[PDB]
């Protein structure tokens with residue numbers, strides 16, 4: 001019902017190696033050429049990616065900033081409010097980035113902050129005008 | 134075991150009745166199952182008695198004595214069973230001291246063309262049925278294709294050599310009646326490449342297992358894909374193997390293509406990662422500058438200038454985070470390419486060294502079938518493996534000629550008598566033969582019936598070596614053209630000293646080329662004396678016949694030298710090279726199931742010919758021309774046992790015709 005295991009005998013393949021006298025060596029030569037074509041295309045992208053590797057040698061070690069570890073504080077200094085209004089105008093609703101900018105407020109605090117100072121800081125307008133970017 | 138082993142050892146099913154028995158006993162088969170089992174017993178029990186001592190005739194009286202009740206109640210049932218068995222050579226066949234000596238006066242006259250084993254087997258049976266039999270033999274000896282070389286102590290069969298197992302083999306019976314020195318055969322066959330050095334066990338098991346694998350593949354190809362016709366021509370075995378190999382070479386290449394295709398897929402995936410990482414590093418390098426400039430505006434500053442430092446700092450750690458997640462991902466792809474480039478699939482299907490070793494297993498198969506694999510029928514070439522005997526294979530150390538010579542005893546044989554024409558008519562037959570030594574002494578033999586055991590090679594000969602008058606009908610001559618008559622030859626090498634491994638019976642030599650795989654590809658150490666036999670198979674056989682003995686023995690010496698060392702190989706004292714296709718009384722070696730033929734042809738060959746009426750409108754005549762030989766038995770062609778069985782078969786049929794069958798009632 002099935003060929004011995006390892007042997008590959010599909011009704012499709014047989015009638016393709018029997019279509020003519022040389023239809024066998026024809027089929028087997030396209031594959032040989034096809035394998036050679038893939039091998040070169042392999043070494044082509046192997047050298048393309050060897051060049052790209054060289055371009056980013058050194059990674060980004062020189063451009064990293066040390067880590068500021070700060071304790072999420074509760075009170076909004078007048079300074080920290082002002083950082084917020086500008087963070088909103090540059091980031092909109094990305095609270096995680098906005099906290100990252102302030103450095104001592106949590107996303108929850110930032111989330112609350114829009115609701116609390118929404119009228120006093122025209123946060124609707126700010127967002128509204130951030131949307132034009 | 135017991136009575137049921139008697140049925141097995143007689144190629145009979147112990148619990149069922151055969152088509153032949155249904156013919157002779159239609160009363161019993163159409164009747165109640167109890168009587169069937171009684172019959173089936175009486176058959177098996179009589180067979181057992183004959184088998185337990187086949188050096189003495191088994192008379193009906195002796196038979197009825199030995200079987201008990203309820204089975205010895207129906208004396209005619211017992212008499213019928215015995216007579217059926219005796220007639221068709223299932224009992225009292227071969228060389229048996231008989232109790233009841235021959236009828237003083239005989240009945241009917243039979244001419245048997247050929248004193249090869251099929252011939253002798255019939256002749257002994259007919260003579261033991263009270264008929265007058267004469268065998269016409271072209272050669273100066275009996276045995277036909279059972280030939281045996283003898284000179285001094287040196288003994289080696291140029292013809293048949295091997296009993297293929299005693300399980301269910303009639304030659305087992307003959308082996309008790311004739312002392313044949315039956316030696317077992319150790320099948321360990323170590324190979325040796327052209328260089329002269331053993332193939333290592335790793336390859337030997339590998340290549341062999343691929344060989345057997347390639348065979349089952351053709352079977353699958355024939356049975357499940359019905360790949361048996363191609364360009365309005367029957368597919369051979371050779372064609373089918375080429376297809377299977379090509380498709381295994383194709384799959385190796387398909388496999389490689391997909392493996393490399395997986396690699397370039399990830400390399401392209403990598404490519405787009407680096408592009409994304411160069412372009413990100415460039416942005417990071419810019420932002421850092423922007424930040425360090427904004428950070429260098431010394432304080433105290435206003436809150437926008439402070440926002441600039443902070444935001445640029447966020448923006449930079451944000452891109453620095455991306456670039457780290459991309460570097461982690463880059464390492465993942467980087468190791469994959471190491472994994473794949475380190476797990477490549479098979480480079481090739483079979484190397485040239487491997488293919489040459491495979492070519493030897495093919496030569497061995499070409500040798501067993503005595504023909505190039507391009508001539509064997511794909512569908513039917515193995516149609517007789519179902520009836521293979523059980524047990525080890527054996528040689529005859531004292532020479533296999535001992536058996537026909539034994540059968541020829543007490544028979545009227547005309548040696549050096551070549552039949553030239555066979556004439557059969559509604560009133561009898563005349564066979565016309567000449568003397569081989571002087572071709573003008575002409576002989577005329579008149580007879581009731583002719584048994585033709587002419588080799589299929591001879592019946593195939595164009596122009597005819599034997600004319601049939603009237604000609605054979607085309608249903609028979611077309612069977613003769615369709616069937617295959619193949620060829621294989623032996624070189625007998627006779628030394629004064631044993632320089633080979635005495636515990637290896639047989640060892641191979643791997644050929645240079647596909648085309649020459651059969652040239653001396655195997656060697657036999659089967660005999661007491663220092664004899665090594667080299668064999669020629671496949672396409673090589675027909676070509677080695679146009680090369681002198683000295684050149685042929687030359688090549689054997691060279692091959693042997695490479696194996697055992699240029700100094701351990703003496704010259705041979707006695708050399709003999711067979712040339713069986715050249716032999717005019719054989720014109721080949723034995724039959725094969727050619728592409729376009731089938732096992733039905735072997736039955737066609739066995740049909741007797743019945744001449745037309747001489748007087749027009751006179752009643753339909755009796756058959757006059759009968760045939761036997763290895764090419765006439767569908768389940769056991771190309772063997773000695775098969776020839777012998779066919780001789781027994783005709784002797785029963787001829788006797789039924791002329792002596793009459795009284796056991797059918």
Ligand SMILES: Cc1cc2nc3c(=O)[nH]c(=O)nc-3n(C[C@H](O)[C@H](O)[C@H](O)COP(=O)(O)OP(=O)(O)OC[C@H]3O[C@@H](n4cnc5c(N)ncnc54)[C@H](O)[C@@H]3O)c2cc1C
Pocket residue numbers: 246247248249250251252269270271272275276277278279291292293294295296297550551552553586587588591598599621622713717718719721722723761762763764770771772773774776
């Ligand atoms: C090399 C070789 C090895 C073999 N090895 C084995 C083996 O190991 N085991 C095995 O079982 N089988 C083997 N066989 C096959 C076996 O030998 C044959 O199947 C069997 O011997 C044939 O017997 P036969 O009676 O059919 O024909 P033959 O033995 O050929 O009898 C034919 C007879 O007809 C004669 N004859 C031919 N033309 C004429 C004519 N015009 N007039 C008169 N007489 C004529 C011949 O001379 C011969 O006497 C082998 C065959 C060969 C060739």
